[PDB]
Amino acid sequence: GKITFYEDRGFQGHCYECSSDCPNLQPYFSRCNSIRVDSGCWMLYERPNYQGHQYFLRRGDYPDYQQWMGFNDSIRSCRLIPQHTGTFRMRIYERDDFRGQMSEITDDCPSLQDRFHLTEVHSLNVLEGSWVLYEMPSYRGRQYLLRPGEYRRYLDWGAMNAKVGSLRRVMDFY
């Protein structure tokens, strides 16, 4: 995994290369206005220790933070999402604590509204591979990284609401 963070736009000024998770990037750069992912899939976070707004980024050039959906130029921590080949699988629940109707999802879902007539998800279990949960349909609004484990309440994936409109498997372009 190789990613480079730059303080200014169009890959100008101070930069820092990273190749593994880092719960605190501040000692390496004061702001982030552009990024180049040379390899791997990443989860970036506005504050250290993996909190604040989250942004998923795959290989490519990001000359300005709007290219990543950034809320601003603060990138304080990052996760190198472990690569996963084969079957990605998760189960969504209408109610918290794994209650009510459950749906098993194994592919990207650009819209839970269209497929399940669902606006919100109260609990979820991921069984294999990491995913990316988005607040609105079509991988829009707030982003949340989901790694294999139980999420009994939307707070476990750290959202501020139960709105879940889309899901994306964390996969390289290849």
Helix (H, G, I), strand (E, B) or coil at 28: helix
Say whether domain 1-83 belongs to CATH 1.10.287.370: no
Resolution in A: 2.0
Equal fold, 1-83 vs 84-174: yes
- Kind of pairing, strands 123-128 and 149-151? antiparallel
**CB atoms near residue 119 (< 10 Å):** 12
Token pair, residue 83, equals 């690569």
Residue 110 buriedness (CB in 10 A; 0-12 / 13-18 / 19+) = middle
Sign of CA dihedral 5, 67, 63, 70: negative
- Tell me the C-alpha distance between 55 and 53, whole Å: 7
From residue 5, alpha-carbon distances to 11, 25, 30, 38 in Å are 8, 10, 10, 11
The CATH architecture to which 84-174 belongs is Sandwich (2.60)
- Tell me the C-alpha distance between 30 and 1, whole Å: 22
Token pair, residue 113, equals 């509204």
Give a three-class secondary structure readout of 52-113: EEEEEECCEEECCHHHHCCCCCCCCEEEECCCCCCCCEEEEEEECCCEEEEEEECCCECCHH
Query: What secondary structure does DSSP assign to 113-170, as a single string?
Result: HHHHS-SB-SEEEEEES-EEEEEETTTEEEEEEE-SEEESSTTTTT-SS-B--EEEE-
Write down the domain spans for the chain: 1-83, 84-174
